[PDB]
């Protein structure tokens, strides 16, 4: 049909435009709905031509912007879904249409209960009269603190993720439920972690090797929390885990325009000085301690089995 190509080009144009739309969960839902439409584009004799089809399309998806991985790894788990269906006909033509339909239907359903399960396991970790530390927001963190503030009392402090700021938008978003939170500059975090006791990080992309590819500022805060030995928790779901690898990927960083750091009222200074700022930094697996997920918390090393059982381990080639 003509509809498939125009709507996937609508998604690659809202991909190439940059940051946005709304969040990764809208990315999940709409990319899953588009791939729901794709498995009803046209028939296929055996699995291989659908695989080259979806492989080429997800290949362009990853290649058009290597910044995030949500569409990439939902394509990869659709690939292990057909791989186990391929296993569950020889273990080509019976009900594979309806089977992949119901498969991604339960994928949708377990996606829309993700942050609510996060709110369920949000309780036991933080205490009362204690202080938690966040850099920017994922809406995971919003559901987290919104659940855990409704029955206890704590004191969240937040240093924003400001090449350009959006942690102040987190601050004004959660402050209208009144947890008595404070904000500070991004370079005052080191002294104040003598009086913190635990820290979360709301990340966006987590990779295979236990490390995490979060917003910038998380590396220096991770090293500062190392030099005070407070525990490190990362509130990412199992959903946005990636199999990719740090220097296997040629500069997984993505810089944005340095207008947000050196503004364009600069005078004559500009044309002899390089200026660059990432959105995404890299912080080793050595330093986190406690995942939380849909099924419960896991070790920093234990995301390895989550990769190997949640992804067919040779779809590293998208």
């Amino acid at each position: 049909g003509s509809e498939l190509s125009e709507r996937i080009e609508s998604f690659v144009e809202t991909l190439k435009r940059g940051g946005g739309p709304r969040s990764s969960e809208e990315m999940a839902r709409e990319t899953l709905g588009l791939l729901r439409q794709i498995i009803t584009d046209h028939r296929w004799s055996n699995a291989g031509e659908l695989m080259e089809l979806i492989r080429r399309e997800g290949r362009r998806m990853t290649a058009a912007q290597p910044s995030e991985t949500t569409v990439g790894n939902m394509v990869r788990r659709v690939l292990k879904i057909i791989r186990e269906e391929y296993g569950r006909l020889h273990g080509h033509y019976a009900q594979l249409q309806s089977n992949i339909i119901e498969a991604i239907n339960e994928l949708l359903v377990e996606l829309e209960g993700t942050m609510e399960n996060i709110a369920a396991q949000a309780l036991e970790h933080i205490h009362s009269n204690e202080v938690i530390m966040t850099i920017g927001f994922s809406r995971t963190v919003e559901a987290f603190l919104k659940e855990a503030a409704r029955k206890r009392k704590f004191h969240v402090i937040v240093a924003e993720c400001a090449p350009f700021c959006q942690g102040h938008e987190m601050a004004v978003n959660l402050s209208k439920a009144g947890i008595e939170t404070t904000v500070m500059t991004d370079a005052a975090i080191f002294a104040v972690m003598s009086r913190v006791n635990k820290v979360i990080i709301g990340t966006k992309t987590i990779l295979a090797n236990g490390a995490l590819r979060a917003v910038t500022g998380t590396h220096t805060l991770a090293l500062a929390a190392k030099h005070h030995s407070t525990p490190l928790i990362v509130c990412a779901p199992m959903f946005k885990l990636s199999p990719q690898f740090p220097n296997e990927e040629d500069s997984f960083h993505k810089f944005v325009a340095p207008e947000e750091v050196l503004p364009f009222t600069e005078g004559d200074i500009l044309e002899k000085v390089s200026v660059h700022c990432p959105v995404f930094d890299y912080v080793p697996p050595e330093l986190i301690t406690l995942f939380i997920s849909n099924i419960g918390g896991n070790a920093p090393s234990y995301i390895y089995r989550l990769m190997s059982e949640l992804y067919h381990p040779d779809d590293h080639v998208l």
Binding site: N209, F245, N247, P284, P285, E286, S301, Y304, R305, P313
Partner: protein, 284 residues
């Protein structure tokens, strides 16, 4: 009946590794002096060749033998005659040898896109596995100078320099004690293991522990390479734990197990605490 067959493969062919030579030795030595039974043949002659092969001071040999005995254990059927227990079911061993010869190709394919340009490299003594990954990295049209150490039970590192200048990269050898003199110069310290054990420990030659303690001294990531063979099944704690027969003036020491950062094999990339996860996946 096979001991100089094994030593012919060993020191009249220095191409392959010692473990893969041992496993080729006994896999082609399924044509045995015929006792023709499942258990007794297996037990006495394989344990006997693992004993009688113990004139060398290596540690990969007996491990590779036991890895083969855990290979042969799995798909050994029972179908009422002593022909296809394994005496006809031997093509499994053929596919095993070719897949764990292709292992070195696949670690080269895995790690060729992993050393970044501009990063100079300091390295310990020789392997048959550092050169394939570094020349699959050079053959991706990259550029990096290399340092290497002396590694003295012998004049060793000159062999690594002669091999690698022939493989076209700028090489400079250094004295053994000059590690911390030049450790900070490096951006990347890769190490071919002798044998990898279940806690991330790398028993190896006399200076890999130097590399690890200087690596934590510099916080520079410390990467080790191993194939599917040489996962030895000991467990070490300190500097007397490994057996004395593996040692003999020592000749092997033991690095700390919990400070290396990324390793990789046939089964992909592994954080060095998933080594137990895959070793439980081994030996059935």
């Amino acid at each position: 009946e096979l001991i100089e067959y094994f030593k012919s493969q060993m020191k009249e062919d220095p191409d392959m590794a010692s473990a893969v030579a041992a496993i080729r030795t006994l896999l082609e030595f399924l044509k045995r002096d015929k006792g023709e039974t499942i258990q007794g043949l297996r037990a006495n002659l394989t344990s006997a060749i693992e004993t009688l092969c113990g004139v060398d001071s290596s540690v990969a040999v007996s491990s590779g033998g036991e890895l083969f005995l855990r290979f042969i254990s799995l798909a050994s059927l029972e179908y009422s005659d002593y022909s296809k227990c394994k005496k006809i079911m031997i093509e499994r061993g053929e596919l095993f040898l070719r897949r764990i010869s292709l292992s070195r190709n696949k670690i080269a394919d895995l790690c060729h896109t992993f050393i970044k340009d501009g990063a100079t490299i300091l390295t310990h003594a020789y392997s048959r596995v550092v050169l394939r990954v570094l020349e699959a990295a050079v053959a991706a049209k990259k550029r990096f100078s290399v340092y290497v150490t002396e590694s003295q039970p012998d004049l060793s590192g000159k062999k690594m320099a002669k091999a690698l200048c022939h493989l076209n990269v700028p090489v400079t050898v250094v004295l053994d004690a000059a590690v911390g003199y030049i450790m900070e110069k490096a951006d990347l310290v890769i190490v071919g293991a002798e044998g990898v054990v279940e806690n991330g420990g790398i028993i190896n030659k006399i200076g890999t522990n130097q590399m690890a303690v200087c690596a934590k001294a510099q916080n520079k990531p410390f990467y080790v390479v191993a194939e599917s063979f040489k996962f030895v099944r000991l467990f070490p704690l300190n500097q007397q734990d490994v057996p004395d027969k593996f040692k003999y003036h020592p000749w092997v020491d033991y690095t700390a197990p919990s400070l290396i950062t990324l390793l990789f094999t046939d089964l992909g990339v592994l954080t060095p605490s998933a080594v137990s996860d895959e070793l439980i996946k081994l030996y059935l």
